[PDB]
Amino acid sequence: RPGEPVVGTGASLSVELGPGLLTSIYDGIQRPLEVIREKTGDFIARGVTAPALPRDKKWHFIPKAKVGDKVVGGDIIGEVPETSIIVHKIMVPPGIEGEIVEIAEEGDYTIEEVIAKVKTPSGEIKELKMYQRWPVRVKRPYKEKLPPEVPLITGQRVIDTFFPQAKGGTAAIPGPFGSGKTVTQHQLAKWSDAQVVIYIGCGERGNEMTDVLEEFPKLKDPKTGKPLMERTVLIANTSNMPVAAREASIYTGITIAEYFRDMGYDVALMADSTSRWAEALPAYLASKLAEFYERAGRVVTLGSDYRVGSVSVIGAVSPPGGDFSEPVVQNTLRVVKVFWALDADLARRRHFPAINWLTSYSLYVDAVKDWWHKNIDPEWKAMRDKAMALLQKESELQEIVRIVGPDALPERERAILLVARMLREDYLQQDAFDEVDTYCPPEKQVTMMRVLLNFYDKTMEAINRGVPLEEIAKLPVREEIGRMKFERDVSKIRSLIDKTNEQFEELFKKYGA
């Protein structure tokens, strides 16, 4: 039911975009959860019954345009406080321009009501509401797609520092989001500097549906202290749902995602995944998947004002079982510019986040280095390169030690392992359960890095002067450097640099052991 008919390839799988999207839980083709099912095919499709946006709910509409104003698609004509977190921006649908000949006054109205009328150049009068419809299969229009430039600040050291995600970029991460082996997936949803989150919690099973049904509605927004759902849109993909819906779920979400970026918001699209993502709609499948990821990006939105928004995509990769080949992983890792490899062995060893700093990668490092250099620290890129070289050296050294033992190791090599270990423990590792280290501000990330890299220089300098490594290993400032991640006052952390220098001096005084 619902209503719809047409020829060509594709009936017209659309989506409603307007107030009532937040806190909402839909499915592959947008409709309140636990509803009837669709039907697909490499041709068209069908449905059944259930709305999308509440027809009864009343929204406070605030006029942001006067009669006589000229407008274009994307222009913002009003504002609606949808939740205590997000202000919904009402825009002229794409492909509509002309003069505003009629506009509602600040009041309360339901979605179907008409809040404005635009007289097109042709003279035709178009009626505008607070919502609009769009074909999930057609990428929403924008003026220009900007090159990766701004990082998506995650707050997680390993990611922000070594494997950056650009706002509007594409990232892949292993296993199901529901997996309890790590909590990085959840840290990403609530700390990334995106105003809105579009969660396609697919690959659900056994109870991962009810595990999110009455749970998330209680998860909080660390930034405001209100429910995270108040700035989220859930898109479930259970096993009793047709392959068709799940297949359309990423398109319904990416479209809703594009819609919010059109307002000037940065939004994060997180797509969960399990075994055999779909079977609706290797060869052609590759083109499709790529097409999806291509709709990611930071753009200059439609509109008269000059506005930027973006959709960053984080997709879960779940191969049939370790094989890490087809479908998921293979095709995906070829598209995405970022890959954070949760490693079960890092996890068993209790190293968190369990991200393998040797097999992860970000093709956005150079793309975001200038933002860091201009706004946070002139030495960002040099510092991370240096820390990575350290970790790279440690890796090679540990391989060799695995063979000939560690007894023949020179002081110089022991020092490298000493500092490399401090990097792993004092920087890479982050406590998602600590009230302070759960989020690490850009400013704090670099200061901690400088404290570590300065300890390194000083360590290699002391060794070159005959200082016993054993003497440096028990240096008092080391224990402070290891609790650094727990200090919320960046200036106290920053002072460890001076505290390090003097201490080495007292080691340059005693001259040795």
DSSP 442-492: HHHHHHHHHHHHHHHHHHHHHHTTT--HHHHHT-THHHHHTTGGG---HHH
Cα separation, 485 vs 496, in Å, equals: 12
Cα separation, 233 vs 502, in Å, equals: 53
Q: How many domains does the chain have?
A: 3
Tokens at residue 417, please?
Answer: 């392992």
Which residues in the chain precede a discontinuity of more than 2.5 Å between C and N?
A: 281
Tokens at residue 448, please?
Answer: 């901690």
Note whether 51 and 85 are same-domain residues: no
Q: Which of 131, 163, 193 is the endpoint of a domain?
A: 131
Which residues span the domain enclosing 92?
Answer: 57-131
Note whether 111 and 213 are same-domain residues: no
Whether the Cβ atoms of residue 487 and residue 436 lie closer than 8 Å to each other: yes
The helix/strand/coil state of 144 is: strand
Cα separation, 367 vs 311, in Å, equals: 17
Cα separation, 421 vs 427, in Å, equals: 10
**Number of Cβ within a 10 Å radius of residue 340:** 28
Q: Residue 44: is it exposed, middle or buried by C-beta count within 10 angstroms (0-12/13-18/19+)?
A: middle
Whether the Cβ atoms of residue 237 and residue 201 lie closer than 8 Å to each other: yes
Note whether 312 and 428 are same-domain residues: no
Cα three-residue angle 61-66-68, rounded to 5 degrees: 140
Note whether 301 and 423 are same-domain residues: no
The helix/strand/coil state of 293 is: helix
The helix/strand/coil state of 275 is: coil
Cα separation, 93 vs 438, in Å, equals: 40
Dihedrals phi, psi of 41, to nearest 5 degrees: 130, 155
Note whether 342 and 430 are same-domain residues: no
Q: Which residues contact 456 (CB under 8 A, 6 or more apart)?
A: 386, 390, 419
Cα separation, 357 vs 129, in Å, equals: 49
Cα separation, 45 vs 398, in Å, equals: 57
**What is the SS3 string spanning 153-218?**
CCCCHHHHHHCCCECCCEEEEECCCCCCCCCHHHHHHHHCCCCEEEEECCCCCCCCCHHHHCCHHH
Dihedrals phi, psi of 223, to nearest 5 degrees: -75, -25
CA distances from 8 to 96, 244, 255 (A): 24, 19, 21
Q: Which residues contact 318 (CB under 8 A, 6 or more apart)?
A: 174, 175, 176, 203, 273, 274, 275, 328
Cα separation, 280 vs 422, in Å, equals: 49
Residues paired with 257 in a beta bridge? none
Pinpoint the alpha helices (H) of 405-440.
411-423
Cα separation, 380 vs 259, in Å, equals: 34
Note whether 44 and 84 are same-domain residues: no
Sign of CA dihedral 486, 489, 493, 499: negative
Angle between helices 380-404 and 365-375 (to 10 degrees): 130
**Number of Cβ within a 10 Å radius of residue 171:** 26
**Number of Cβ within a 10 Å radius of residue 371:** 18
Whether the Cβ atoms of residue 94 and residue 141 lie closer than 8 Å to each other: yes
Q: Which of 131, 155, 189 is the endpoint of a domain?
A: 131
Note whether 268 and 399 are same-domain residues: no
In 3D space, the residue among 202, 190, 256, 178 whose CA is nearest the CA of residue 227 turns out to be: 190
Report which secondary-structure segment, H or E, holds 256. Answer: helix 243-262
Residues paired with 271 in a beta bridge? 200, 315
Tokens at residue 10, please?
Answer: 């594709």
Cα separation, 244 vs 28, in Å, equals: 8
Within its chain, how far is the Cα of 110 from the centroid? Answer: 32
Sign of CA dihedral 173, 178, 179, 182: positive
Pairing of strands 232-236, 25-27: parallel
In 3D space, the residue among 234, 261, 260, 235 whose CA is nearest the CA of residue 248 turns out to be: 235
Note whether 488 and 353 are same-domain residues: no
Cα separation, 348 vs 350, in Å, equals: 5
CA distances from 151 to 84, 139, 364, 442 (A): 26, 23, 8, 11
**Number of Cβ within a 10 Å radius of residue 384:** 22
The helix/strand/coil state of 87 is: strand
The helix/strand/coil state of 227 is: strand
Tokens at residue 68, please?
Answer: 């006589």
Ramachandran bin of 30, using left for φ above 0, alpha for ψ from -120 to 50, beta for the remaining angles: left
Tokens at residue 30, please?
Answer: 């947008």
Note whether 498 and 427 are same-domain residues: yes
Total residue length of the chain: 513
Residue position matching structure tokens 């695995």 = 402
Cα separation, 327 vs 279, in Å, equals: 11
CATH of the domain at 376: 1.10.1140.10
CATH of the domain at 271: 3.40.50.300
Ramachandran bin of 74, using left for φ above 0, alpha for ψ from -120 to 50, beta for the remaining angles: left
Q: Which of 337, 362, 387 is the endpoint of a domain?
A: 362
The helix/strand/coil state of 314 is: strand
Cα separation, 256 vs 199, in Å, equals: 11
Cα separation, 288 vs 402, in Å, equals: 45
Note whether 331 and 401 are same-domain residues: no
CATH of the domain at 105: 2.40.50.100
Cα separation, 193 vs 149, in Å, equals: 14
Burial readout 422-439 (b: 16 or more C-beta within 10 A, e: otherwise): bbbebbbbbebeeeebbb
**What is the SS3 string spanning 28-39?**
CCCCCCCCCCCE
Note whether 247 and 176 are same-domain residues: yes
Whether the Cβ atoms of residue 433 and residue 182 lie closer than 8 Å to each other: no
Within its chain, how far is the Cα of 118 from the centroid? Answer: 37
Dihedrals phi, psi of 151, to nearest 5 degrees: -75, 155
Cα three-residue angle 457-460-465, rounded to 5 degrees: 125
Note whether 152 and 127 are same-domain residues: no
